[PDB]
């Protein structure tokens, strides 16, 4: 309780905040604790510029996904606040944060499975699917992939956009995304099956 108050005081009236403080919170982060942590995690996401601070928090959400899973409340309780903070981040901010954001969606999806951000996220992914370096591309491919696994649930409509996203990439001639794009294609095969027709 006391720790939170000091950090809040640090804000632009007077940085310690995102960089060092957030890093510290990340360390403490690394389920019982989740209720207590929530506000602080929220602050980290909010302080976009303490970009580094934001990156660390976004990264923490991902780590929370793997540890908590469904408990993480990606499907559950915790997700609802986090997803809108994340969504807002995109809406309003260093460009570098966004890619990390897009992959986190994937980790969130893996955990939650069934919970309904899908329309907004997939659409967001579509716009992003358009460029921002390969950094964004790798991130977008990653977000589709955990979404696909995570569900083991819907996404079929999108497959034709995604492969065509991959197709454009094919002409581009530049690498890290290749691994991610390959990973997605394999994932599609498992879920969809018939996606070969689109590939051919």
């Amino acid at each position: 309780s006391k720790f939170v108050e000091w950090a809040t005081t640090g804000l632009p009236k007077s940085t310690y905040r995102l960089y060092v403080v957030f890093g510290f919170l990340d360390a403490f982060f690394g389920t019982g604790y989740a209720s207590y942590i929530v506000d602080a995690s929220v602050k980290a996401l909010k302080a976009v510029e303490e970009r580094n601070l934001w990156k660390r928090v976004l990264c923490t959400l991902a780590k929370c996904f793997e540890h908590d899973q469904d408990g993480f409340w990606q499907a559950p309780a915790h997700f609802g606040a986090v997803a809108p903070v994340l969504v807002e981040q995109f809406l309003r901010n260093v460009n570098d944060v966004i890619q990390d954001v897009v992959p986190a969606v994937v980790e969130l999806a893996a955990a939650v499975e069934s919970q309904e951000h899908y329309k907004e996220i997939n659409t967001a992914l579509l716009k992003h699917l358009r460029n921002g370096s390969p950094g964004v591309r790798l991130a977008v491919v990653k977000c589709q992939q955990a979404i696909t696994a995570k569900l083991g649930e819907d996404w079929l409509h999108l497959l034709p956009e995604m492969l065509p996203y991959i197709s454009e990439l094919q002409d581009d001639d530049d690498e890290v995304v290749e691994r991610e794009n390959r990973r997605w294609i394999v994932g599609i095969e498992e879920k969809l099956g018939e996606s070969l027709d689109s590939m051919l």
């Binding site: 294609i185 394999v186 599609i188 095969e189 498992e190 969809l192 099956g193 018939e194 996606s195 070969l196 027709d197 689109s198 590939m199 051919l200």
Partner: protein, 148 residues
């Protein structure tokens, strides 16, 4: 690990596939498992594993070398139409091979001695596995599969 040398290769556009001789080198380990050979090959060719079917192998009298023949199909959708029903149950795609002989021989028994009336009925009881059935199952592997 292993070392494979591809040996004699033909190009059959007719059945849309390439046929090749394989020479696995396992000096140390025992005969290679078709499965493992399947992938070290697909890698050298750089083709989806399930579009590459390997059959028939040997093993020179203790020496770590095994000869075999394999197939490369371009469209698993072609591979599925051409490969033999027995090679499919082998990849666990088609399934079982129930004992037709006996019963079929026994139905011949009854049918050969009836008038159309019942015959039809009988026929509605001859051990399954229609070709019409083989297709629907082949088809399902078609849609439901996509990748690489």
């Amino acid at each position: 690990t292993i070392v494979i040398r591809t040996k004699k290769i033909l190009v059959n556009p007719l059945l849309s596939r390439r046929q090749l001789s394989l020479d696995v080198l396992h000096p140390d380990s025992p005969t290679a498992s078709k499965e493992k050979i399947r992938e070290e090959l697909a890698k050298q060719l750089k083709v989806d594993a399930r579009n590459v079917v390997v059959y028939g192998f040997s093993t020179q009298y203790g020496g770590g070398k095994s000869t075999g023949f394999a197939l490369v199909y371009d469209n698993q959708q072609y591979l599925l139409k051409y490969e033999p029903n027995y090679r499919l149950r082998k990849v666990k795609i088609l399934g079982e091979k129930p004992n037709t002989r006996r019963s079929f021989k026994e139905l011949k028994r009854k049918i050969k001695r009836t008038s159309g009336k019942a015959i039809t009925k009988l026929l509605s009881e001859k051990k399954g596995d229609t070709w019409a059935s083989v297709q629907s199952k082949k088809s399902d592997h078609l849609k439901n599969f996509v990748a690489k």
